[PDB]
Amino acid sequence: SMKNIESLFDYSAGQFEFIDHLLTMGVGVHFAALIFFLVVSQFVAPKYRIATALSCIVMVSAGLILNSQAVMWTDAYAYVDGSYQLQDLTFSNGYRYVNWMATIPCLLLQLLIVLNLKGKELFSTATWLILAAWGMIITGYVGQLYEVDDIAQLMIWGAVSTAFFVVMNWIVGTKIFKNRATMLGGTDSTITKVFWLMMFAWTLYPIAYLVPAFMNNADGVVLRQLLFTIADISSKVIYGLMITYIAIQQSAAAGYVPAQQA
Ligand SMILES: *C/C=C(C)/C=C/C=C(C)/C=C/C1=C(C)CCCC1(C)C
Ligand SMILES: CCCCCCCC/C=C\CCCCCCCC(=O)O
Ligand SMILES: CCCCCCCC/C=C\CCCCCCCC(=O)O
Ligand SMILES: [Cl-]
Numbered sequence: 001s002m003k004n005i006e007s008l009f010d011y012s013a014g015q016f017e018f019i020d021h022l023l024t025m026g027v028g029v030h031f032a033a034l035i036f037f038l039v040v041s042q043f044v045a046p047k048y049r050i051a052t053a054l055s056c057i058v059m060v061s062a063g064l065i066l067n068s069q070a071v072m073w074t075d076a077y078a079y080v081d082g083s084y085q086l087q088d089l090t091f092s093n094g095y096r097y098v099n100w101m102a103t104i105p106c107l108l109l110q111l112l113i114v115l116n117l118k119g120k121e122l123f124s125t126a127t128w129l130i131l132a133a134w135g136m137i138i139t140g141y142v143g144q145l146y147e148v149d150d151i152a153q154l155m156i157w158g159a160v161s162t163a164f165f166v167v168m169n170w171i172v173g174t175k176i177f178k179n180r181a182t183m184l185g186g187t188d189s190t191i192t193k194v195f196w197l198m199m200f201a202w203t204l205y206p207i208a209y210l211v212p213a214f215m216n217n218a219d220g221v222v223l224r225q226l227l228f229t230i231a232d233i234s235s236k237v238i239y240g241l242m243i244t245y246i247a248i249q250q251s252a253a254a255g256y257v258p259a260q261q262a
Contacts, residue, residue: 001092003145005211009218010083019222022229023070030063033237040244043262045251051110052247055240058106062236065099096228097141104133107239108172111198114246115175115191116182129171136164140209147212158209165206169199184253187246194242201234 001007011019037055044052069091076091077084108129112122143157176195180188208227211220251259 001094002089003148004092004094005148005216006091006093006221007086007089008148008216009221010085011077011218011221012083013079015218015222016077016079016084019225020070020073022225023066023073026066026229026232027063027070029233029237030059030066033240034059034063037240037244040248040262043251043258044244044247045254045256045259047254048114048247048251051113051243054106054110054113055244058103058236058240061099061103061106062232065095066232068095093144093224094141097137097144100137101134103236104137105130107235108133110240110243111172111194112175114183114187114243114250115179116250117175117179125171125175129168132164132168132171136161136168139164140206144209147209151213154209154213158206162206165202169202172198183246183250185249187249190242190246190249194239194246197234197239197242201231201239204228204231204234 034056037052037059041049041052041056072091072095076086076088078087105126109126112125112129117125139157140161143154143161146153146157173195176191180191182188183191204227208224208231211224211227214220215223248259248262252262
């Protein structure tokens with residue numbers, strides 16, 4: 001709450017409205033995508049259809065937290081004497097962290113679904129990834145509690161966090177490069193692209209996490225939200241658009257009529 005660097009600075013109108021406009025824009029993008037993921041669920045064979053539902057759940061999950069950040073952002077600061085100054089203790093990024101605990105399993109689970117895992121291997125691989133992801137999120141959460149008070153502790157908890165992250169991506173890549181032969185309609189190619197999109201998009205988060213360490217000012221608060229914004233759109237919206245394209249393609253190849261007509 002009062003432990004993040006946002007509570008340390010006044011913000012010009014340009015900075016403050018630009019952050020607000022980033023968060024509100026993120027609301028309209030996620031809820032717009034929800035409609036798309038929703039309408040296309042009928043062109044998906046029952047095999048992969050849960051991957052699309054998981055996108056919808058992600059769109060609303062991220063959308064409600066962005067909407068909450070937007071409102072909290074406007075409730076915390078008031079334009080006084082030519083700047084926006086903290087009025088209450090309501091804004092913090094810790095609500096992004098508590099969100100990721102939900103959305104990250106969904107993002108991984110729909111990856112395993114289109115990879116065509118099933119049964120024991122779906123349940124086993126899902127458990128380790130979700131436990132490695134949560135370990136990454138919980139040590140990352142504890143680390144940003146100190147982004148103001150203890151920069152050293154932020155580095156340590158970040159290092160513990162990145163161990164989970166690396167173990168997590170290793171497992172992900174291992175299943176992709178061992179199961180892509182199974183995939184239909186040529187998506188063995190597409191899935192390789194998705195994996196790198198993950199590598200890129202998700203790597204932006206630890207960079208946002210480190211902003212207080214190399215850019216401890218108000219334009220670092222703007223840079224961070226701009227980094228988070230690019231990361232969400234790529235890791236949730238674009239990622240799920242590709243998961244969706246893979247679901248339909250494989251559905252059509254496997255003889256699902258609604259898919260083959262779309
Ligand atoms: C939609 C949100 C997503 C996909 C969030 C992903 C978050 C991460 C990959 C966070 C990673 C972190 C580390 C690897 C170490 C530093 C602390 C974190 C949590 C920022
Ligand atoms: C840490 C708590 C447990 C986390 C592991 C989660 C395990 C994932 C289990 C199944 C997820 C949904 C399965 C959907 C597969 C589609 C097959 C079907 O439609 O019958
Ligand atoms: C559930 C039982 C234990 C689970 C282990 C969780 C993984 C934690 C890994 C190591 C984190 C240690 C970092 C300690 C912070 C040092 C800063 C301090 O002095 O408080
Ligand atoms: Cl999220």
